[PDB]
């Protein structure tokens, strides 16, 4: 339950049934260096730097928050 | 948020629904009072759009 | 005010009874009907609105109640568990009030 407001939602729902999230069979690769993002400012050429920031672990899993549907909202989804 | 194949990135204060969604293809027939999942009258306080 | 009566009170078993809404007012924003005493919405039944005229339904829609435009809900099958309480959600203006109760009994 996301927020805190009622709205006039014009979608059906249904609790019917739900399910853990798919966590999917693919894992976090960062050799092709997927995950990473450019040093704000600089430019290096021809280098290996160790940096630092803000990064995923590599190994671990991902997740599918991909919800979907039709015409119907599944309640216990939120 | 995408729409048109621009992001739609808004830091702003919404007042979000109970029961979010969004859609690929949203119509409303000219219904002001209806939100996907947002449902502020006001112009939302907010630093970034 | 707004009044809602059974018609009849008391139903006998896999019968119609019509949750009939009087004196309900005009710009709506929309409605639903509510299971039991209560407001969350997993008991929120069938939620149809006067502006954009779609009916659509909650979990709890055992999917033999038709909601109609007069706000009134027609059962098609009175069963033994739908004895109880039944609260009517009404929203305008982003402001809302439940003060549409009714309760029925089977036999
Ligand atoms: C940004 O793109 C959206 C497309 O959905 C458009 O409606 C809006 O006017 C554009 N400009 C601004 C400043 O938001
Ligand atoms: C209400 O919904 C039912 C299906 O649940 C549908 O058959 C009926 O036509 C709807 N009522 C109106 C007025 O569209």
């Known amino acids: ?78 | 948020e995408p729409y048109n194949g621009v992001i739609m990135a808004s830091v702003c204060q919404y007042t979000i629904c109970q029961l979010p969604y969004t859609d690929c293809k949203p119509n409303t027939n000219g219904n002001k009072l209806i939100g996907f999942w947002h449902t502020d009258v006001k112009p939302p306080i907010c630093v970034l759009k | ?107």
């Open chain 1, 1 to 78: 339950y996301i927020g805190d407001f009622r709205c006039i939602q014009l979608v059906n729902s249904n609790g019917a049934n739900v399910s853990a999230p798919s966590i999917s069979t693919e894992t976090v690769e960062v050799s092709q260096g997927l995950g990473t993002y450019y040093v704000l400012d600089r430019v290096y050429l021809n280098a290996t730097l160790l940096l630092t920031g803000y990064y995923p672990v590599d190994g671990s899993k991902f997740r599918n928050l991909a919800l979907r549907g039709t015409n119907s909202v599944s309640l216990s989804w939120f």
């Open chain 3, 1 to 107: 005010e707004v009044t809602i009566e059974a018609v009849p009170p008391q139903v006998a078993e896999d019968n119609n009874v019509l949750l009939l809404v009087h004196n309900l007012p005009l710009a709506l924003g929309a409605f639903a009907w509510y299971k039991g005493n209560t407001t969350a919405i997993d008991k929120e039944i069938a939620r149809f609105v006067p502006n954009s005229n779609m009916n659509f339904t909650g979990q709890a829609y055992s999917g033999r109640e038709i909601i109609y435009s007069n706000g009134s809900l027609l059962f098609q099958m009175i069963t033994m568990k739908d004895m109880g309480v039944y609260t009517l959600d009404m929203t305008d203006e982003n402001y809302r009030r439940t003060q549409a109760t009714v309760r029925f009994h089977v036999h």
